[PDB]
Structures are given as structure tokens and as C-alpha cells.
Design a protein around this ligand. Structure first.
Ligand SMILES: [Zn+2]
Lengths: 49, 49, 169, 48, 92, 169, 96, 345
DNA sequence: AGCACAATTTAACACTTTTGTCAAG
DNA sequence: CTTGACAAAAGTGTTAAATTGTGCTATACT
């Protein structure tokens, strides 16, 4: 449940890092992010009920 | 006795937990497989049984 | 010096509040990222809110009880105990005059029944979503001349002050 | 808030119902509710 | 569910996710004040709706905590537990 | 004169005649209908409160900002190397930020639109530093969760200073 | 808690319990000397260490906080004395 | 509602196409040059009469009445400038209207591009500003890009504005977000470093190390320079942050008060202040009253040997030996009474 | 997100003064 | 209780190195 929402939170961060920079060929490596997902999971794995 | 630069800091033992030392665990900044807080030096977690 | 048997509470005025303050804190900088000392205008400022160290002023031009109460002329810090930092207040000179939400959203709605208005309508006003009338100056409105203690809208106000006009592309 | 555009209600409201990715009606919900009311709902959606 | 991530546009899709190998055993974590977590790699492909650029690359997600044998996890050296949540089943 | 927001309210609240309204309401009290009569009662209660306390209602619209002393909500470091700050601090911060930027826009000659935008953000920030969340969704620490505890938020509640500290400690 | 090394709570129920019996000074110490009051708690240790009786408190210091706290809302905190007259809550402090 | 507010306020006024746009910019520049033209009329600075236009334009009494307790008041430093150029022939009095209409047109074009500025700040969220803030400062960036724009260059103002909006926003970031003031360049380098880290994390399939992350940063980048400033970067911590898992505990309530000396210290200190007074009386009327002046016991400020010797009439040498002997002479009384032998910390 | 540059602050450093001290008076 | 002599600690001043605060960037982009 937290993997999905915490992934979507990165889905938007993906769609945003697209509309700019160098649209020609950007490896998905520069497109994807870590923190928006990672911290989102750790959130549930620590501060949840 | 002069007032020396450095003053005592060192961590004593709680009022009511009298134990015996068992685990001697030291973690120095600059050792393999240990990443400490950003700008902190060696730590220690001692066990008292 | 006198037995305290009584304590009142009442409203305060901009003047009285100006008096309570020792200066106007401006800059958002709480404290420096380096010296961690009260900034020039910092919220935690030691210049007008009194010393963090008893009798020791900021720079240290006066470091002891010897010179008591004498205002520092260099760094601008009155020599005294660090206790004053827990009492001596401060203030902020608000650019445009602003109200207090309490009297507004309160159950009896102080300002509202005061001036004889309603929570909703007065709300639109105070929060700058809706104009209100003060001395209409003979201004007509839809056959009924607008009068004081009345409410207007973004359009009509212009249509009165700047006049009405239509556009035809 | 947003203007009553004819394309905004084509996207939003859609995303709230026929969209299995924004509406996950649990396999149970798509299952349990399926056998009471007498119907065949396919996806985890509401509409199609 | 969260894929493909779309936007002349971008069709970035999902392919796989590499199951990480625990960096530090459940012991090391308990004595390092570290969470028992493993890097979860992810493999995907970035394509364009026009350019037809099929450019593929294995990216990376983060570190996912792992469960012990008994059913409790390790969080910053302190082992924690994930209990169960109750509510009326979805439906009508 | 359509003036909107706190400014206008300040002017009209200033113009008020306590006495005249008093007599008017007194006569309004003799109205046979329970409506006008009740209204006159419940309204005049306020005016009366002002007439007696001798406090002027315009004070409700405040130009200054009574800023609590620094040491009453400090920022102090603890063991481990990181600092710690009160909620009211960041609140006061947002307050002065909007307050200053507003001035920046004023002398600048900026158009009416931007003016109303910031001039209103002033009322919302200021009132947020007094009671945070009694009007509109409360403001929380940037990007996280817990709503900043304002002045009125420290007083009320079961943990209010009147209880957790002064009626028991 | 025993962690931070501190005393128990005297919260309102306890206060009332004291008011019941009628122990005044016992309640005083609670609200001031034995708890918070600045010069009071010190004058206590002073007295007891010197083998005498502790003076009666004045400023609870929590209340002193409340004063300026209210003042932040533009609430004039007017403290009167025995007949409708000024009183300086904060000793010689904010007197400007 | 403040959110919908601005959106519905700007959505009231339309945009501007090439026609209106080019025209407006031309109007503004014409008003500007008109001011420079009238700047030689009475000899008034181009900026002076410029703001003097504001007096009757974007407010009558509200522009100069309260920029603090003091500014340029309507009757004094304004009125003599309003009714000064007020008597000049046609060839002058016309530039007045040129400046009026130019000045208005400025604000106009701004309002026109506002529907852009807001749509700009949309990407820059998460900076510790929920929309409206970001938008405000962006509006300032617009005001800048406005007076600096040049229509003559045949460039769409939407291009020139954006580069300035992004500026006034990315600037407002460092001057707002972190509770502790963090200078611009600091944050700049922060974002640089964090970018490199958040980048090579996926590259190496794990987190970096202060040595390898600073490696790709440049020269002089060791484990220290990154880990050091890393501390600075970290913002303070809300005292309302709940401790433990139960709904009671507060963060702030968990902090001690060492600011004021504890009662035990009140008596500990007041004890020494006395015990040193009684063990002092065994000194000669000179070597005692002098033994206080060197410790800052007398006037609270310390009195150097040079001055003490001037106070007793003796020499910078005599007082020196006086202190020595007087002191150890007390050391005998201490080592024989054990009254003060504590306080050794 | 990144940059050149002016504005101050801080740091390095050159050298005078003060204060503390040694030996003899 | 004291004199001349003199190391170390302390002081007054200039300059170098470092830190900090501002202004701009123009395809167009609402
Ligand atoms: Zn000073």
C-alpha cells in the first residue's frame, strides 16, 4: 500500500523531470529518483501505527 | 588546579541500573562498514547486565 | 512592595504594544548558521531583547556587574541579567493595518455585532475578497443609491469609480 | 477552483471511476460485491 | 498500477525489479543501529512516442527492509513489528 | 470609497460613536417585536463593554505586532549536533516575511492585484500566528505534518499552560 | 518519568484534594516553592541547608510566562494590588 | 479562500497577444523616456518624478503615507514636486501624460503576464512555500523583467519574464526555507552536492561515501567539506515533534534548563562566597584587600598589578610578592582546617 | 540550477605595550 | 618593601584570504 502511493509520488516526479532539460535522448537514469520512494516507504516502516 | 581547556563529559551510569559490562561495542569514524552522523566522532554502545 | 490581591485583563493598544517592545525585529534570520548568535534583526535577537549572558553584552565592551544597566554604545546591548530575555517583549510594525482573527471567528463575533454586521459578509470584507462602502459620494447603484455600511464587488466598484464600458471585437 | 472546461470533466471524473489505477477496488470488493447484486463487473473499476 | 508513466512525449514503461541482497546481515544491523534493508534495483525502458528512441537503462529505487524468520523487521537496530489492520471488506 | 480589508474596518471602527449608538439601541430596545428588541440587547452588550472598559474598539485592528520574548520560545541545540526550535518561531517568521515583501511591493508602485494578494496574505499569516487553523486549513511545518502551535493554541486544550503547568505541575 | 530525573505531577485533581483538607501553604509550595518559583525554590534550599524556615513565595515563574504570553495577543495583563493600583509582575524587568 | 482567490482574480483580466503586448511595452518605454525628458525640465532626477507619478496613479494617499514612520510625505517632499512642473508650456505638459499612460501601461502588462507567473511558480513548490508565497515573489521577478524588457528586440515577453521569475523564486528559496539563515552560495553548493549524490546513488546501486561523493564534486572536496556543511544544511527541529509512540509526549518538554543556576548551585556558590570571606580575615589589612583586587572580588573588574601598586603606594614588584606569600599563607589554613578543601570539581 | 562580482567579514600578520618575573637591593 | 631588567602575554594596525549579498540570462513557455 505504501509502495504504490510512494511510487506514484515518484511518478509525478518523473513526469516533471521530462518536460524540460534535453528531451532528445535522456536515459531513464537521469529521469528516475530515489528519495521520493525510499523515504516514502521508510515513513511507514517507522512512524506509522 | 587550573581550569583546563577540556572539561569532563564522559557518560556515567544511571541511578539504579547497577550492572556488569559485557558488550564492548566501539564505532570509530573512519572504519569499514560504519557511517556515522554528519560531523561526529567515535561513538560507543556498551551493554550492562 | 505591595500585596497583590487583584488581577485584571483587558485589550491592548498599538501604542501600549509599542511600549512593551524594545525594538522591531525584521529579518527572518533566527540566528547565523555559523556563529549561532542572535542576528541583527533575528527573532532571538540579543541586541534589544537583552543579553544571553548576565551583564555581559554582545561584543563584550561591558562584561561585568560593575557597569550596571549602562546601555552599550558599541554593539548596542544593555548590560543586565539574561532573565530580561524571557520578559522584555518586541514588536513588528505591520505595513498595512491588520485585524485580530479572535474577535472575528469568535462565537458572539465581537467586531460583527459591534459594527452591526454578520460573520459571513464581514468575512468577505476583512479578508479582502469584497469591497465595502464608506461615504458613497452620491454614487448611484442599480436604481438604489449605495450608502455606507453596505458591500460592493470587484466590478461595480470600478463601474462607479472608473465608469462602465463595454468591449466589441 | 478549476474552470468548468469540457475537457477537465473528461479527465478528472474519468480518473475517479473507470480508472483502475486511481481506483483500486480490492479483488475482494470486485469479488464479494460481484456475487450479491447479480452482476459481472470485470475490472476493479466502477464504470468503463 | 503506476505504469506506464506517460507525458512529442515519453512512454517510460516498467520491466522488472532486481531483488537486492542484504548488505548487512540482521545481526550487523542490530549492532550498527542500521535498518535491515536491501537495495532494490529496477529495470525499465525510456522510449519516445515519435523519435522511437528505445533507450533502456537499469535504474535504482532505494532500500527496502527485509523480514526475519519470526515475522518482525529491523528498524535502525531496534526490531519492530507490523501488526494487522481491520475494516469492512471493500464492496457494496 | 470602497476600501477593502482591515484598513477600511480600522477607519470605520475608529469613527464609531459609543454614546450615540448606545442611546439608539436603548430606544431600539422598546420595539414590540422580540427580534429588534433581542438584537438591541445582544448588540448593546458589546458597545456597553467598550463604554465601560474605556477601551477603544479600533485597537482590534492592530498596526504593531506584540512579539513574545525570544527565550520564551528559544532555539537550543542538544546532544548529537542538531538544533531544536519552537513552532511559534517559524510562524513569526512567515509573518515578517509577508510583512516585509508587502512594503517592498508598496513603495515599488506595484499594481492593485499583487497588492491585494500580499495585503491579504498579511491578514492570513498574522492571524495564523494568533490562532492557527480557526480559519481555513491550518499551516504546518513545510512539507511535513504537525500544525504549528500558535499563541491561542498554547492556552486552550487539556495541555494548556493553565492546566499542565499552572493548575498542576 | 525517572528518565529525565524529576518529580511527580501535582495536576489539578491533586490541587483540589489539597484544597479539600484546607492546607493552604502546602498548596503554596506546590504551586511555587517546591516546583517552579525562581527565587523561591532557591531560597528553599538556602533555608533548609541553613536549618530554618523557608520564606513565602511570590512569583511562580510559570505565571510570569503566562503574562507575556497573553501580552503577545495584545492582552494587557494588568495586575492590581489591594486597591485597584499598578503592580509590577516582572520585577524591574520589562519596565523600559 | 486564499488559494482559489488569486486564481479567480487574475482569471478576471485576460492575456495579451502580439498587438497589445508590443504596444504596451512601447507605451512603457515612451513614458520612461518622457520622464528622462522632463528630468531636465525642472532639474529633477529621472527616478524622482517617476515615483511622483505614483502619487496620483496607483494610489492617492496610500503610497507614501506609511512606508514606516518616515518616507516622502505628501505635503512636504512630494507636493512641492507635484505643483512644480505643473506650470510648463505644451512641449513639457504633454510628457506628463506620456508618463501617466506609460506608468499605467507598465502595471497593465504586468497584470497581463500574471496568469503566467502563477503557472510558473507551480514547478517550484516544495521549497517551504505553499504556492501563494512562491507566486508573490515570482510577481516581483515579473516586475523586474518588466522594466528591464526591450520590445525592440522582437522577443516575446513570455521568454524574458520566465528567466527572471525563476530567478526571484530560486532566490526567495534560500532567504526563506531554512529556519537558520543560509547564504545563497551555501544552498547553491548544497543543491550541487545533493544532486551528485542523488545521481550516483542509482549509478552505484547504493549510497556513496563522503570520499567518493566529494570526489566527483571537484578540487578541495574531501570527506570533511561535504560532511561539515552537511550539518549546517540541516534545519532545526520542531519542539512539537512527538517523542515515543504515545499521544502525550512532547519534544520541547524533554529539554532541561541550564540557563539559570540550579538551587543547589545557588547554595553551592553562596557558600563559597562566604567561606572564602571568613578564611580571608586571617590576612593582613594589605594582603587581603589587595588579594581581592586581583581576583575581581572588589569592583568586579580585575585590577592588574600595575594599578594595585598605585593604590597602595607600593611598587609593581611589592604587590607581586604580597600576593604569593599572602596566598600560600592561606594554603596553610586551608590544609589545616579542611573547611574549604572541597570545590575541587 | 548556475555564475560573475561587489560588499563585508574574517584571517593572517607585523609589531608595540603591558604585565609578570629574575636577581639583587 | 624595592630597582633595573626582561619573557610572555597582549595590543594597535595593515593586508590577505574568505565570506556574503546582488544582478542577469531574451525562441517561446500564461
Ligand atoms: Zn558592547
Amino acid at each position: 500500500d505504501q509502495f504504490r502511493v510512494g511510487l506514484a509520488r515518484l511518478a509525478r516526479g518523473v513526469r516533471e523531470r521530462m518536460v524540460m532539460g534535453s528531451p532528445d535522448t535522456l536515459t531513464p537514469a537521469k529521469l528516475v529518483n530515489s528519495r521520493p520512494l525510499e523515504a516514502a516507504l521508510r515513513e511507514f516502516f517507522s512512524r506509522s501505527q | 588546579e587550573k581550569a583546563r581547556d577540556v572539561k569532563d563529559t564522559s557518560l556515567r551510569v544511571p541511578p539504579g541500573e547497577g550492572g556488569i559490562v559485557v558488550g564492548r561495542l566501539r564505532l570509530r569514524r573512519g572504519d569499514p562498514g560504519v557511517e556515522l552522523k554528519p560531523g561526529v566522532r567515535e561513538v560507543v554502545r556498551v551493554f550492562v547486565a | 512592595k505591595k500585596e497583590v490581591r487583584k488581577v485584571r485583563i483587558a485589550l491592548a493598544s498599538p501604542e501600549k504594544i509599542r511600549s512593551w517592545s524594545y525594538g522591531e525585529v525584521e529579518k527572518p534570520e533566527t540566528i547565523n548558521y555559523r556563529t549561532l548568535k542572535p542576528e541583527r534583526d533575528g527573532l532571538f535577537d540579543e541586541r534589544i531583547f537583552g543579553p544571553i549572558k548576565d551583564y555581559e553584552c554582545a561584543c563584550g565592551k561591558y562584561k561585568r556587574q560593575r557597569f550596571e544597566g549602562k546601555v552599550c554604545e558599541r554593539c548596542g546591548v544593555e548590560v543586565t541579567r539574561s532573565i530580561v530575555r524571557r520578559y522584555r517583549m518586541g514588536h513588528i510594525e505591520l505595513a498595512t493595518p491588520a485585524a485580530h482573527i479572535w474577535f472575528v471567528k469568535d462565537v458572539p463575533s465581537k467586531i460583527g455585532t459591534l459594527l452591526d454586521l454578520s460573520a459571513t459578509e464581514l468575512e468577505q470584507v476583512l479578508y479582502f475578497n469584497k469591497y465595502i462602502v464608506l461615504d458613497p459620494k452620491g454614487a448611484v447603484l442599480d436604481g438604489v443609491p449605495v450608502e455606507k455600511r453596505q458591500l460592493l464587488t470587484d466590478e461595480e466598484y470600478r463601474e462607479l469609480r472608473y465608469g462602465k464600458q463595454e468591449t466589441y471585437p | 477552483g478549476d474552470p468548468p472546461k469540457k475537457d477537465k470533466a473528461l479527465a478528472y471524473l474519468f480518473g475517479l471511476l473507470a480508472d483502475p489505477k486511481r481506483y483500486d477496488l480490492g479483488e475482494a470488493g470486485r469479488y464479494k460485491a460481484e456475487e450479491k447484486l447479480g452482476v459481472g463487473l470485470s475490472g476493479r473499476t466502477l464504470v468503463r | 498500477e503506476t505504469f506506464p508513466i506517460e507525458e512529442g512525449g515519453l512512454v517510460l514503461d516498467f520491466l522488472e525489479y532486481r531483488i537486492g541482497d542484504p548488505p548487512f546481515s540482521q545481526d550487523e544491523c542490530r549492532e550498527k543501529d542500521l535498518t535491515y534493508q536491501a537495495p532494490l534495483y529496477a529495470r525499465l525502458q525510456l522510449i519516445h512516442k515519435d523519435t522511437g528512441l528505445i533507450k533502456e537503462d537499469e535504474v535504482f529505487l532505494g532500500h527496502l527492509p527485509l523480514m526475519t524468520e519470526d515475522g518482525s523487521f529491523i528498524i535502525n537496530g531496534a526490531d519492530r513489528v507490523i501488526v494487522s489492520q481491520i475494516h469492512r471488506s471493500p464492496g457494496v | 470609497d470602497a476600501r477593502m480589508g482591515a484598513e477600511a474596518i480600522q477607519e470605520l471602527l475608529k469613527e464609531l460613536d459609543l454614546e450615540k449608538l448606545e442611546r439608539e439601541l436603548l430606544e431600539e430596545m422598546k420595539h414590540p417585536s422580540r427580534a429588534r428588541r433581542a438584537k438591541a440587547r445582544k448588540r448593546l452588550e458589546v458597545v456597553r463593554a467598550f463604554l465601560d472598559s474605556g477601551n477603544r474598539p479600533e485597537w482590534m485592528i492592530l498596526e504593531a505586532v506584540p512579539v513574545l520574548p525570544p527565550d520564551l520560545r528559544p532555539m537550543v541545540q542538544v546532544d548529537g549536533g542538531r538544533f531544536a526550535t519552537s513552532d511559534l518561531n517559524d510562524l513569526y517568521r512567515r509573518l515578517i516575511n509577508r510583512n516585509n515583501r508587502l512594503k517592498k511591493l508598496l513603495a515599488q508602485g506595484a499594481p492593485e492585484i499583487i497588492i491585494r494578494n500580499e495585503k491579504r496574505m498579511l491578514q492570513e499569516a498574522v492571524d495564523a500566528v494568533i490562532d492557527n487553523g480557526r480559519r481555513g486549513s491550518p499551516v504546518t511545518n513545510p512539507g511535513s505534518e504537525r500544525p504549528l502551535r500558535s499563541l491561542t493554541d498554547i492556552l486552550s486544550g487539556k495541555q494548556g499552560r493553565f492546566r499542565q503547568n499552572l493548575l498542576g505541575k | 518519568g525517572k528518565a529525565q530525573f524529576g518529580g511527580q505531577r501535582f495536576g489539578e485533581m491533586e490541587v483540589w484534594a489539597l484544597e479539600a483538607y484546607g492546607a493552604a501553604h502546602t498548596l503554596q509550595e506546590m504551586l511555587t516553592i517546591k516546583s517552579d518559583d525562581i527565587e523561591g525554590r532557591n531560597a528553599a534550599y538556602q533555608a533548609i541547608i541553613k536549618g530554618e524556615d523557608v520564606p513565602e513565595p511570590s512569583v511562580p515563574e510559570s505565571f510570569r510566562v503566562l503574562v507575556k504570553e497573553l501580552q503577545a495577543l495584545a492582552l494587557d495583563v494588568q495586575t492590581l494590588d489591594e486597591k485597584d493600583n499598578p503592580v509590577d509582575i516582572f520585577e524591574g524587568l520589562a519596565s523600559k | 479562500d486564499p488559494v482559489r482567490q488569486y486564481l479567480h482574480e487574475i482569471g478576471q483580466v485576460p492575456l495579451l497577444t502580439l498587438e497589445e503586448e508590443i504596444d504596451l511595452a512601447r507605451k512603457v518605454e515612451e513614458g520612461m523616456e518622457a520622464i528622462k525628458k522632463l528630468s531636465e525640465a525642472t532639474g529633477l532626477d529621472q527616478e524622482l518624478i517617476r515615483e511622483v507619478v505614483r502619487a496620483k496613479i496607483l494610489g492617492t494617499a496610500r503610497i507614501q503615507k506609511i512606508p514606516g514612520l518616515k518616507e516622502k510625505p505628501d505635503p512636504k517632499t512630494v507636493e512641492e514636486v507635484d505643483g512644480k512642473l505643473k506650470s510648463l508650456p505644451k512641449e513639457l505638459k504633454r510628457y506628463l501624460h506620456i508618463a501617466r499612460e506609460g506608468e499605467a501601461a507598465r502595471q497593465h502588462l504586468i497584470e497581463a503576464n500574471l496568469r503566467l507567473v502563477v503557472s510558473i511558480a507551480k514547478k517550484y513548490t516544495g521549497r517551504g512555500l505553499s504556492f501563494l508565497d512562491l507566486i508573490q515573489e515570482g510577481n516581483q521577478g515579473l516586475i523586474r523583467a518588466v522594466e528591464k524588457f526591450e520590445y525592440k528586440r522582437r522577443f516575446k515577453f513570455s521568454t524574458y519574464a520566465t528567466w527572471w521569475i525563476r530567478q526571484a523564486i530560486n532566490r526567495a528559496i534560500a532567504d526563506q526555507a531554512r529556519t537558520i539563515r543560509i547564504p545563497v552560495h551555501m544552498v547553491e553548493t548544497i543543491n550541487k552536492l545533493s544532486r551528485t549524490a542523488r545521481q550516483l546513488q542509482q549509478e552505484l546501486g547504493r549510497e556513496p561515501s563522503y570520499e567518493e561523493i566529494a570526489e566527483a564534486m571537484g578540487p578541495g572536496w574531501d570527506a570533511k567539506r561535504v560532511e561539515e556543511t552537511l550539518k549546517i544544511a540541516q534545519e532545526p527541529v520542531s519542539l512539537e515533534t512527538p517523542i515515543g509512540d504515545e499521544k502525550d509526549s512532547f519534544y520541547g518538554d524533554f529539554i532541561p534548563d541550564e540557563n539559570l543556576p540550579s538551587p543547589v548551585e545557588a547554595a553551592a556558590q553562596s557558600l563559597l562566597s562566604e567561606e572564602l570571606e571568613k578564611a580571608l580575615s586571617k590576612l593582613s589589612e594589605r594582603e587581603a584587600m589587595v588579594l581581592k583586587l586581583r581576583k575581581g572580588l572588589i569592583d568586579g573588574r580585575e585590577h592588574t598589578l600595575e594599578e594595585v601598586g598605585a593604590y597602595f603606594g607600593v611598587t609593581r614588584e611589592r604587590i607581586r610578592q604580597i600576593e604569593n606569600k599572602a596566598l600560600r599563607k592561606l594554603k596553610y589554613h586551608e590544609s589545616r582546617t579542611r573547611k574549604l578543601r572541597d570545590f575541587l570539581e
